[PDB]
Amino acid sequence: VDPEIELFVKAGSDGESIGNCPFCQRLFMILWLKGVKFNVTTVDMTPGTNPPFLVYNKELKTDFIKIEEFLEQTLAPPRYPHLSPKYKESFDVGCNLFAKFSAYIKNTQKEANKNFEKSLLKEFKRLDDYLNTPLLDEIDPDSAEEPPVSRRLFLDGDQLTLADCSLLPKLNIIKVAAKKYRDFDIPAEFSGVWRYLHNAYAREEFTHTCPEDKEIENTYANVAKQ
Ligand SMILES: N[C@@H](CCC(=O)N[C@@H](CS)C(=O)NCC(=O)O)C(=O)O
Ligand SMILES: N[C@H](CCC(=O)N[C@@H](CS)C(=O)NCC(=O)O)C(=O)O
C-alpha cells in the first residue's frame, strides 16, 4: 500500500530518454531511496512549467523545492526512511560548487581560464576536506580512536542522504561538461572527492538516474565554446 506517485522529468534529445536536469535527478533519487512505488514520465521540451513536477494521489505539485520537503516529510517511517542528513554541513558543503562551475564553463575569455579554474578548484578542495575529515560519529574499528582519514562512503555517513541527492547530480554535470569543454579532470589528489565519486557511481540509485553524458554535453555546446 503506497501512495500513487508519477514524477515528470525532462526528456533528452530523442524526446524520450532521461535529459539533463539535476533537480529532476535529485527527486528521482529521493523517490528511489524512499523505497516507494513510483513511475517516471519524461517530458519533451521541444500543465505547469519546466520539469520536474510530481502528481501525488491525483494532486499536481510544481514548486520543486517544496516537492523535496513534502516527499521527505510525507514518506516517513515506519514505512519509508527519513533521508535528511545527520549533519547540516553535509548540505552547506558544495552549496557554491555548481555556481563556480557555471561561471567557469561559460567564460569565453581564454585569458581568464586559469582564474576561473582556480575558483572551481577552491570549492573542490573544500568538499575534499569535508570528505577526508572524520565526522563526529566515526570510530576506527581496529583502534577505537578517531580515524586519521575518514572512510565513510558518502557525504554524511555510510548511507545516501538528501545531501547526496542534491550534490551528486551536480558533480556528474561538472565532471562531464568540464572534461568535454575545458579538458578538465577533477584532480586525482582530491582523494576524498574520488572516494565519494567511486562509492556513489557504484550505486544504481545514482548511476541509473544519470542522463547519458551526451545530454550534458549538448546542454553546454553553445555556451562553453571559446
Ligand atoms: N581577475 C583577473 C583577470 C581575468 C579574469 O577575468 N578573472 C575572473 C575569473 S575568477 C573574473 O572574475 N573576471 C572579472 C571580469 O569580469 O572581468 C586577474 O587575476 O588578472
Ligand atoms: N522514461 C524512461 C526513463 C525511466 C528510467 O530510465 N528509469 C530507470 C532508470 S534508467 C529505473 O532504474 N527505474 C527503476 C525504478 O523506478 O525504481 C526512458 O525510456 O528514458
From Swiss-Prot:
The keyword Oxidoreductase applies. It is a single-pass membrane protein. Residues 88-226 are annotated as: C-terminal. Glutathione binds at E16, H208. Changing H82Q: Found in a patient with syndromic intellectual disability; uncertain significance; results in stimulation of RYR channels activity with channels remaining open for longer times; the mutation may impair insertion of the protein into the membrane to form a functioning ion channel. SUPFAM superfamilies: GST C-terminal domain-like, Thioredoxin-like. GO terms for cellular component: chloride channel complex; cytoplasm; cytosol; membrane; nucleoplasm; nucleus; plasma membrane. Keywords: Chloride, Chloride channel, Cytoplasm, Disulfide bond, Ion channel, Ion transport, Membrane, Oxidoreductase, Transmembrane, Transmembrane helix, Transport, Voltage-gated channel. Residues 1-77 are annotated as: Required for insertion into the membrane. Pfam families: CLIC-like_N, GST_C_2. Residues 76-87 are annotated as: Joint loop. A motif (G-site) lies at residues 21-24. CDD domains: GST_C_CLIC2 (cd10298), GST_N_CLIC (cd03061). Its main location: cytoplasm. The chain crosses the membrane at residues 23-43. Residues 57-220 form the GST C-terminal domain. Coiled coil: none annotated. PROSITE patterns: GST_CTER (PS50405). Monomer. Interacts with TRAPPC2 and RYR2. Belongs to the chloride channel CLIC family. This is Chloride intracellular channel protein 2.
